[PDB]
Write a protein that holds these residues in place. Structure first.
Motif, PDB file in Angstrom:
ATOM      1  N   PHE A   3       1.771   1.699  -2.381  1.00  0.00           N
ATOM      2  CA  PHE A   3       2.177   0.782  -3.104  1.00  0.00           C
ATOM      3  C   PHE A   3       1.997  -0.157  -1.561  1.00  0.00           C
ATOM      4  O   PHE A   3       2.947  -0.558  -1.571  1.00  0.00           O
ATOM      5  CB  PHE A   3       2.773   0.281  -3.639  1.00  0.00           C
ATOM      6  CG  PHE A   3       2.422  -0.848  -4.588  1.00  0.00           C
ATOM      7  CD1 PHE A   3       1.425  -0.270  -6.321  1.00  0.00           C
ATOM      8  CD2 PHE A   3       2.767  -2.104  -5.206  1.00  0.00           C
ATOM      9  CE1 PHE A   3       1.089  -1.707  -6.379  1.00  0.00           C
ATOM     10  CE2 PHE A   3       2.450  -2.951  -5.668  1.00  0.00           C
ATOM     11  CZ  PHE A   3       1.755  -2.938  -6.452  1.00  0.00           C
ATOM     12  N   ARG A   4       0.812  -1.062  -1.664  1.00  0.00           N
ATOM     13  CA  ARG A   4       1.021  -2.454  -0.475  1.00  0.00           C
ATOM     14  C   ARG A   4       0.661  -3.656  -1.244  1.00  0.00           C
ATOM     15  O   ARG A   4      -0.019  -3.882  -1.953  1.00  0.00           O
ATOM     16  CB  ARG A   4      -0.144  -1.662   0.639  1.00  0.00           C
ATOM     17  CG  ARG A   4       0.444  -1.032   1.549  1.00  0.00           C
ATOM     18  CD  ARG A   4       1.692  -1.539   3.018  1.00  0.00           C
ATOM     19  NE  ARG A   4       1.721   0.013   3.620  1.00  0.00           N
ATOM     20  CZ  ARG A   4       2.172  -0.680   4.659  1.00  0.00           C
ATOM     21  NH1 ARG A   4       2.640  -1.701   4.388  1.00  0.00           N
ATOM     22  NH2 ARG A   4       2.801   0.927   5.714  1.00  0.00           N
ATOM     23  N   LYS A   5       1.027  -4.604  -0.589  1.00  0.00           N
ATOM     24  CA  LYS A   5       0.774  -5.874  -0.094  1.00  0.00           C
ATOM     25  C   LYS A   5      -1.213  -6.030   0.448  1.00  0.00           C
ATOM     26  O   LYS A   5      -1.641  -5.518   1.329  1.00  0.00           O
ATOM     27  CB  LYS A   5       1.027  -6.773   0.625  1.00  0.00           C
ATOM     28  CG  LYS A   5       2.641  -7.868  -0.036  1.00  0.00           C
ATOM     29  CD  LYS A   5       2.165  -9.056  -1.450  1.00  0.00           C
ATOM     30  CE  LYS A   5       3.108  -9.212  -2.146  1.00  0.00           C
ATOM     31  NZ  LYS A   5       3.937 -10.418  -1.100  1.00  0.00           N
ATOM     32  N   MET A   6      -1.819  -6.021  -0.337  1.00  0.00           N
ATOM     33  CA  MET A   6      -3.020  -6.456  -0.178  1.00  0.00           C
ATOM     34  C   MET A   6      -4.154  -7.058  -0.673  1.00  0.00           C
ATOM     35  O   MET A   6      -3.861  -7.667  -2.139  1.00  0.00           O
ATOM     36  CB  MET A   6      -3.817  -4.836  -1.456  1.00  0.00           C
ATOM     37  CG  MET A   6      -5.001  -4.612  -1.291  1.00  0.00           C
ATOM     38  SD  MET A   6      -5.651  -2.774  -2.015  1.00  0.00           S
ATOM     39  CE  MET A   6      -4.128  -1.772  -1.399  1.00  0.00           C
ATOM     40  N   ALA A   7      -4.664  -7.507   0.532  1.00  0.00           N
ATOM     41  CA  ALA A   7      -5.535  -8.196  -0.126  1.00  0.00           C
ATOM     42  C   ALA A   7      -6.605  -8.470  -0.388  1.00  0.00           C
ATOM     43  O   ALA A   7      -7.953  -7.383  -0.004  1.00  0.00           O
ATOM     44  CB  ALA A   7      -5.118  -9.781   1.192  1.00  0.00           C
ATOM     45  N   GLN A 127      -2.007 -12.113   0.788  1.00  0.00           N
ATOM     46  CA  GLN A 127      -1.677 -12.366  -0.256  1.00  0.00           C
ATOM     47  C   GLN A 127      -0.425 -13.454  -1.053  1.00  0.00           C
ATOM     48  O   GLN A 127       0.908 -13.141  -0.108  1.00  0.00           O
ATOM     49  CB  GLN A 127      -1.649 -10.910  -1.031  1.00  0.00           C
ATOM     50  CG  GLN A 127      -1.932 -10.932  -2.436  1.00  0.00           C
ATOM     51  CD  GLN A 127      -3.550 -10.864  -2.678  1.00  0.00           C
ATOM     52  OE1 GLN A 127      -4.120 -11.037  -2.016  1.00  0.00           O
ATOM     53  NE2 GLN A 127      -3.505 -10.938  -4.585  1.00  0.00           N
TER      54      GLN A 127
END
Ligand SMILES: Cc1ccc(NC(=O)c2ccc(CN3CCNCC3)cc2)cc1Nc1nc(-c2cccnc2)cs1
Ligand SMILES: Cc1ccc(NC(=O)c2ccc(CN3CCNCC3)cc2)cc1Nc1nc(-c2cccnc2)cs1
Lengths: 301, 301
Positions: A3-7, A127
């Motif tokens: 789970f990642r900070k995703m843009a 993000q």
């Protein structure tokens, strides 16, 4: 897994970024069809700053005062008008890379991707969430004004943010693409400061569900709370109140995990009252509140 | 001001992603000039899995077995060859959107952007670091194989990672674009597991400098340590040893802040031995090690 900070992929927006110069001021514009959108304070000069009147300042401008550059090509301005706090510059060429798009205003707690640009050139993507006090905790240096925030739904870009300024605490303020500021901020030098903020409770719960989906389970408990007794504890820790609509939005995540929303709230209550005690959740040592229920579903089914 | 997990703009890579299908297996390929690159395990069938021989499996394939789709257009395969763990599929059309590019292998501790794709369509972008055990902590679901990791230097894309598989602990493993795995992993079903990892010490120090550049200063102290006495403490907490070359790389950040590297190391030593005591650094409650000295300079001068 993971789970990642995703843009969102930024290619559709990169093809729209241009550079707008007025006198000695240069910032970024957004080129859609035959119009360029940019912050109106590009027409601000030195001995204005304090109390500018943008109506007066724009009346004194001519089309040839605006230099628009799309990469190595100069665009000829053929009209100009004020749209609240944004300027609309009509150019003689429609952008051949214009995607399908909408102008949409977002609500506090919702997230979007930011394409930071300098001199009309994209620099990085990240993000953000709109906070309860209508600021965003961005990453912006001088020259980034006019950078935009957006979401993508299938083939359509929903533009929701244009960057205008930085507040004293280092947080950022801006407008929607109709030029209306988020929050009680103005594009001039005042003593304006961000109001108080709260933690976005539905987002923290969404992120706890993402943790369970990814196998982080140590914070789970056998207990269930009522929506009323949970909100009693949330106010003490400066969390937003949880509503029945928030419970419904968390339905799909609740169904996939088998963990009822009010059961997860009893885990959140215990984390608030006791802390993490040296452990992490999804690689974080604090409770993260910038992932929406939608972000979670999209990233990890 | 501000500091965010920031990825490179992905537009140049989005224009290269295609979909490769072999039988009932579909994954992502990278289309550069007249060649498509994808993981060779796209030719794996069911009753192989255990002990496949990819040499045998590729000898049994014909060009017409590979279906390549670039959006809504099918590309005709006219040649194929094995490049270690990646397949090279020669197509009859050179990609008109091929950027300037290089194939580069990165080192543990270095970072890159990941464009996650499914069915040849970009889904999101995020930032990763190669860990000391040659895994990455990514966000990948089934169907993401062939997604690539990259950096951008001016106009040139440096491809450094193609995604191949997920390990039991949920971390991810892959190859460079020459098809050579990062770390001691193979593209078949074994009991393989990630080795032990360490914290990237030079990156933590870079991030502390970013904190000072952004006004977070509570962790600073009047003390300075020697490089030897610092490494004595770093080993106890499973940090990588700090070298003189790391000190030099941190020079520019050290000059800008006026804080000597060995003075910042005495702050890191105290944080390790005492913890944060309820405070945060740049919005984090633990020490972040996935920002390089370059990432920091690039984002916040
Ligand atoms: C809200 C607002 C109103 C007016 C202005 N413009 C000015 O203050 C201004 C404009 C022109 C000049 C004259 N020239 C002075 C020399 N350089 C060229 C310009 C001097 C000052 C800028 C803003 N917004 C700004 N945002 C930032 C900023 C900084 C870091 C991150 N994100 C935004 C700096 S200024
Ligand atoms: C290393 C490796 C070797 C061989 C394979 N391919 C197979 O195991 C395989 C290939 C074909 C089939 C037959 N068909 C079965 C039914 N669906 C279509 C395929 C069954 C199994 C895949 C991989 N890599 C994988 N990475 C993932 C994965 C999961 C989550 C996130 N990132 C990667 C799943 S499998």
């Amino acid at each position: 897994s993971g789970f990642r900070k995703m843009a969102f992929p930024s290619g559709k927006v990169e093809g729209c970024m241009v550079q707008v110069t007025c006198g000695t001021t240069t910032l970024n514009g957004l080129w859609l069809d035959d119009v360029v959108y940019c912050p109106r304070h590009v027409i601000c000069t030195s001995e204005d700053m304090l109390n500018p009147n943008y109506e007066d300042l724009l009346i004194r401008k001519s089309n040839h005062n605006f230099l628009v550059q799309a990469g190595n090509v100069q665009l000829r301005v053929i009209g100009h008008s004020m749209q609240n706090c944004v300027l609309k510059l009509k150019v003689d060429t429609a952008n051949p890379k214009t995607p399908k798009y909408k102008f949409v205003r977002i609500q506090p707690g919702q997230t979007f991707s930011v394409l930071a640009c300098y001199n009309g050139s994209p620099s990085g993507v990240y993000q953000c969430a709109m906070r309860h006090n209508f600021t965003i905790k961005g990453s912006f240096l001088n020259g980034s004004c006019g950078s935009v925030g957006f979401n993508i739904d299938y083939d359509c870009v929903s533009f929701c943010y244009m960057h205008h300024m930085e507040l004293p605490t280092g947080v950022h303020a801006g407008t929607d693409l109709e030029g209306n500021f988020y929050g009680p901020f103005v594009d001039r030098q005042t003593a304006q400061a961000a109001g108080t903020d709260t933690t976005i409770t539905v987002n923290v719960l969404a992120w706890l569900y993402a943790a369970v989906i990814n196998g982080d389970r140590w914070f789970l408990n056998r207990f269930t709370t009522t929506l009323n007794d949970f909100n009693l504890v949330a106010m003490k820790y400066n969390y937003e109140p949880l509503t029945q609509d928030h419970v419904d939005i968390l339905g799909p995540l609740s169904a996939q995990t088998g963990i009822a929303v009010l059961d997860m709230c009893a885990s959140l209550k215990e984390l608030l009252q006791n802390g993490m005690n040296g452990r992490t959740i999804l690689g974080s040592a604090l409770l993260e509140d910038e992932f929406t229920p939608f972000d979670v579903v999209r990233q990890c089914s």
